[PDB]
Amino acid sequence: LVVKLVKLTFKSPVHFGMKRLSDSNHTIAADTLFSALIIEALQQQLELSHLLNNLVITDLFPYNKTSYFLPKPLIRIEGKKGDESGYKAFKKLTYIPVENYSEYLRGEIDSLEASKIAESLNLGKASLSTKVSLQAVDHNGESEPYSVGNFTFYPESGLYFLAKGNADTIGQLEILMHALQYSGIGGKRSAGYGQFRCTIEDSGKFDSLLSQTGNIAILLSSAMASDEELVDCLEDARYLLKKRTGFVQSKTYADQLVKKKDFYAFSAGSTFYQKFNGKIFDVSDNGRHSVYRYAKAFWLEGKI
């Protein structure tokens, strides 16, 4: 299939949330972006067959000047036989530059070098902007303060994600991302947060990295497997279960917005000796439509 790197440079502060409005996150999983893509394709009156049948995206990872970051793989690192706080430094570390990814998979990285890699990330700063609600003041009430957490990417930094699919799927992705540049991604995109510009191009470096074949597999997107594959993939695996929850965002779902069914997915960067392909899990209950949660798997091979 065709692989395209999409680089997102954000012109405005961005509100990515995990559980609350005040919480600000620097990245979004693949499920959030797939929800945005489905919403956009519905707005643009476009078919959902390509996205639901062949699109394979990853999460959004940091990038900066001359470095593209990948999730820290969940491998058994030997550390230093002297100190245990080296493992603390490794757990604090979260993202590895693409150049150092193979080295980290082969060890060869000290705890001090791990902290250096962690601090080498040049991805913006998060803040908490406090706003008010004045709608109660007209009918004999008080102003209600409330905080929104936002994230400001540094001028040459931003997010990126790889996308794999057919030529037609890649074209639909290009059109939908062009529309999404102005639709915005985030949690307050109707109040200014999340305006961005995307650039979609084929990357030789990342294509070569994906072409690399190793003994183990690494998840690049928040994914989960069905029972037939879950009985086999879990053997000798190091993963992390993320609790994907959220409210439904759509006018036609119900008279009032209600929560989705709680989902659990393998975080990006988990290590599996056996590879699995995810499914688009339906997380709606008794709804007018079916809410889609993305759990397909984008695999990066590695040597440990």
């Binding site: 005040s22 058994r76 100190d83 706080s85 902290s115 905080s147 879950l230 190091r238 929850t245």
Partner: protein, 716 residues
């Protein structure tokens, strides 16, 4: 009850040491073992054959001429004492940190004087003090103390209360790091473990098993007789701090205490299944517990069953919000003795196994049950929003409302407030109410804050001290007559704590008793001494244990007590240990999760480079403790406070002009600052000092921080 006799004798094998040191209460002029045997024979309940045999004969010469029947507890006590251990009457207890980090910072001369700090000056424990301790021990053993399992737990608490500051080895040449209580507790734990191992092995004669040729002694030391077991709870900090709403600022400490009591209940259940006391519990801190167990097949089966039961319970109640992982490694007696230098290797291996278990925490069926949900919640709790469980009225979950209901003993009974594993409930009860619950409900464990199992945890909360402040936990702190109404959040952390445990102790000094002493010292500092440090300040401590701290309160009180905490930690550690702190200032109604996360970011910033650093407020203000205590506050902030409090306006307009000029690096801005200082009409020497501080980088930042602190100090 032979196991109970063995435990009673093992814990009390070195009791005669105190009397033999006293030399003032009918000195027998004999071996400390014989004096202890006589002392136990004084009391009829303790006159049991096992106890006196264990006390009298726990050394090679005594055992050779013991003339006791085979399969006796004296041999077990002897070998356990030998494993744990591996003569001036007045020898001070030596600070453990003297040995710690000796390869780099040398060996210290700190000695405890008969909570206390090492005074660093040599002092001799008066024999009269030993005699007074012997008299108190005699009186307590006469009536208060008894014989039995619960009596054994009470005896362990009494031993911790008395012998915690009495040296284990009376010899002055031998290092006095391990105290008598630590050595006795480790001896009791090892004796219980070897007794279980031999009972599983069905050893007919104990002396033939280990003593008769004395080759079998080293053979037994070679055998993998023990297990080092670690339980770790994941999700503690996320559970405590990820809460939203006006009730979070009062539910914080309740959630933390609930988690600590849940861990204590878990380890108590584990010990009860294995039929062991809390002596086997080597350490328990921030969600982490280390224990020593027998290597019997029954012990491994109990560990597997306990792991399965706890995983199932935590999945049923919290569903990935909290988990507990338990991993064990087989341990050789020589490893505890560190003869081969394999003690730290054993600990690191068990930690690696624990981490590996944390990686693959959930099984196939558990994941399948997680993903398959019937219906959406359609209603969630205001804090820790969970749709799965039935949300009651006012939008509070069953756990969430119980934690609200909790907010002086803790009772783990069939009926209570908050669910606890093995189908129990935790409820805070009055002493008489707790006793009533014990009488009404059999098998009811009760914990006493700082049949009661004494639990050490820092509970300092200034709000609960005053009835008006009892209503609002922290909004009581924020209100001030003068000074900006803000909150100070302190996230402190001991740096290289794992390195201190592993590399801090030299390989020649590594042992099980040494590690127990070090861990007990750390816990005793961070649970009991912390409250005495924080006395008189508007600070409430949410978490403790060194590896993680949290002290929320007024910003100025928080920074002052952080300085005092650094001074006290320097005194107690006597060097060899530096802790990095992050301090943040936030308005009231600021999200709790945001406060915790941003102060954690500040702490992470302070951990960089040299770890002896404090990251104050904004991330650009990362200083050293000496820099902040003296240069920022005492050298600069105090003279400015004097000069401006002399003025009628208290500044507040001059300071902002100063800050605006200091933000710029223009030379003309330096000239403008000179003119502003000239017009301000300060003292000329202070004016020149301020100008020079502004001229010199790394002093301009200190001046700016002093100015900002002064501005926050006076805010109408």
């Amino acid at each position: 009850n032979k196991k109970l006799e063995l435990m009673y004798g093992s814990l009390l094998h070195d009791i005669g040491k105190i009397v033999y040191r006293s030399n003032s209460v009918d000195f027998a002029k004999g071996t400390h073992s014989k004096i202890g045997s006589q002392f136990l024979n004084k009391f009829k309940p303790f006159q049991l054959s096992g106890i006196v045999d264990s006390v009298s004969y726990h050394h090679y010469k005594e055992l050779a001429s013991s003339s006791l029947l085979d399969d006796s507890v004296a041999y077990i006590t002897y070998i356990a004492d030998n494993i744990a251990s591996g003569f001036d009457k007045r020898a001070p207890l030596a600070s453990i940190f003297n040995v710690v980090n000796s390869e780099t910072k040398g060996l210290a001369n700190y000695t405890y004087s008969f909570y206390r700090y090492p005074t660093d000056a040599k002092k001799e424990y008066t024999s009269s003090q030993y005699a007074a301790l012997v008299n108190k021990m005699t009186d307590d053993l006469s009536n208060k103390l008894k014989v039995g399992p619960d009596s054994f737990s009470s005896l362990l608490q009494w031993t911790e209360s008395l012998w915690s500051y009495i040296p284990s080895s009376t010899d002055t040449n031998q290092v006095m790091d391990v105290s008598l209580y630590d050595h006795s507790k480790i001896t009791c734990a090892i004796a219980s473990c070897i007794y279980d191992y031999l009972t599983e092995m069905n050893c007919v004669n104990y002396r033939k098993e280990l003593f008769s040729p004395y080759e079998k002694t080293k053979q037994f030391y070679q055998e993998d007789v023990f297990l080092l077991v670690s339980l770790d709870m994941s999700g503690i900090q996320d559970f405590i701090y990820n809460i939203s709403g006006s009730k979070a600022l009062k539910s914080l400490r309740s959630r933390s205490f609930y988690l600590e009591t849940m861990l204590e209940s878990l380890v108590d259940d584990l010990l009860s299944d294995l039929e062991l006391s809390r002596a086997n519990l080597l350490y328990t801190g921030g969600g982490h517990a280390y224990l020593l167990l027998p290597n019997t097949e029954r012990a491994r089966d109990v560990l597997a069953s306990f792991e399965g039961e706890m995983k199932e319970w935590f999945i049923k109640i919290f569903k990935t919000d909290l988990s507990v992982a338990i991993a064990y490694k087989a341990c050789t007696g020589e490893d505890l003795m560190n003869s081969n230098g394999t003690y730290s290797d054993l600990w690191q291996t068990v930690s690696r196994k624990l981490s590996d278990k944390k990686a693959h925490k959930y099984s196939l069926n558990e994941i399948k049950l997680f993903n398959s949900t019937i219906h959406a919640g359609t209603q969630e709790c205001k804090e820790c929003l969970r749709s799965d469980i039935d949300i009651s009225e006012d939008s509070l979950c069953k756990i969430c409302e119980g934690i609200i209901a909790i907010s002086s003993f803790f009772v783990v009974s069939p009926e209570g407030k908050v669910p606890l594993p093995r189908n129990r409930y935790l409820s805070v009860e009055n002493q008489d109410g707790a006793e009533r619950k014990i009488k009404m409900n059999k098998e009811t464990r009760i914990y006493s804050k700082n049949l009661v199992t004494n639990l050490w945890m820092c509970d300092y909360d200034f709000s609960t001290l005053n009835p008006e402040t009892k209503k609002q936990g922290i909004a009581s702190y924020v209100n001030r007559e003068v000074g900006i109404p803000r909150l100070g959040v302190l996230r402190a952390d001991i740096d290289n704590l794992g390195t201190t445990f592993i590399k801090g102790i030299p390989e020649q000094y590594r042992s099980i008793s040494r590690t127990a002493t070090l861990s007990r010292q750390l816990s005793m500092f961070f649970k009991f001494e912390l409250s005495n440090i924080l006395k008189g300040a508007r600070i409430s401590v949410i978490y403790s244990g060194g590896d993680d701290l949290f002290l929320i309160g007024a910003w100025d009180d928080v920074i002052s007590k952080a300085l005092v905490l650094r001074k006290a930690f320097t005194r107690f550690s006597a060097g060899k240990l530096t802790f990095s702190a992050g301090i943040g200032m936030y308005p009231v109604k600021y999200p709790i999760s945001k406060m915790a996360s941003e102060t954690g970011v500040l702490e992470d910033l302070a951990k960089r480079g040299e770890k002896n650093q404090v990251a104050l407020w904004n991330d650009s203000k990362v200083f050293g403790w000496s820099q902040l205590e003296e240069q920022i506050l005492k050298e600069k902030m105090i003279p400015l406070q004097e000069a401006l409090t002399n003025s009628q306006e208290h500044g507040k307009s001059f300071l902002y002009k100063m800050l605006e000029l200091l933000r710029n690096e223009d030379q003309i801005n330096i000239a403008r600052l000179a003119y502003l200082l000239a017009r301000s009409s300060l003292s000329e020497e202070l004016t020149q000092s301020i100008f020079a501080w502004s001229q010199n980088k790394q002093q301009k930042v200190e001046l700016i921080t002093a100015i900002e602190y002064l501005v926050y100090q006076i805010r109408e």
